[PDB]
Amino acid sequence: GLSDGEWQQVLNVWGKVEADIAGHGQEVLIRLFTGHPETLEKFDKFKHLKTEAEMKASEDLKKHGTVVLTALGGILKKKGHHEAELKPLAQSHATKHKIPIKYLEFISDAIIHVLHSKHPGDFGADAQGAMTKALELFRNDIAAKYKELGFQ
Ligand code: HEM
Numbered sequence: 001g002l003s004d005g006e007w008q009q010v011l012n013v014w015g016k017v018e019a020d021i022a023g024h025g026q027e028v029l030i031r032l033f034t035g036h037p038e039t040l041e042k043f044d045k046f047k048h049l050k051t052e053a054e055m056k057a058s059e060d061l062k063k064h065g066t067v068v069l070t071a072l073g074g075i076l077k078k079k080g081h082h083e084a085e086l087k088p089l090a091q092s093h094a095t096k097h098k099i100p101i102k103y104l105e106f107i108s109d110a111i112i113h114v115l116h117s118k119h120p121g122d123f124g125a126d127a128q129g130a131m132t133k134a135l136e137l138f139r140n141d142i143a144a145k146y147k148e149l150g151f152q
């Protein structure tokens with residue numbers, strides 16, 4: 001549950017991401033894969049990537065980064081009213097991709113890390129607080145759908 005002031009901060013921060021969605025998406029996935037290598041194993045189309053250089057050079061990874069952040073951005077712009085948008089993602093990630101909720105925690109923190117890295121001194125305490133709450137909300141609603149499906 002975010003205030004409108006907090007949603008305003010979230011969408012303000014998101015403006016930074018939308019100026020370069022592919023660059024942000026790329027670095028988020030790289031931070032995930034390098035920080036938590038077991039996550040790479042869930043992707044049959046990235047599992048071949050052994051080095052970060054190969055990751056950085058991968059146009060398909062950048063493409064998928066765009067798909068992921070486009071989807072997340074669509075969800076964030078709903079300001080919490082994202083049932084329709086979130087349900088198919090929860091379902092595909094639980095039933096098809098088999099992504100435990102822990103990995104969504106991982107990618108949440110990776111987003112926070114990337115924003116600080118690309119915008120040092122431009123991602124204030126209030127902005128981090130708001131973005132963090134937004135990602136927690138996202139994670140929590142996915143977690144509810146996971147519970148429904150009995151997915152661990
Ligand atoms: C903010 C969090 C995430 C968002 C918004 C997101 C979004 C998406 C979208 C839109 C797709 C393509 C459509 C679909 O299959 O549903 C997708 C596919 C996929 N996602 Fe995610 N995802 C997220 C987190 C993760 C994480 C943390 C993992 C694994 C560690 C993951 C694993 C996958 C895999 C394996 C696919 C299929 C890739 C392919 O073969 O094309 N996702 N995701």
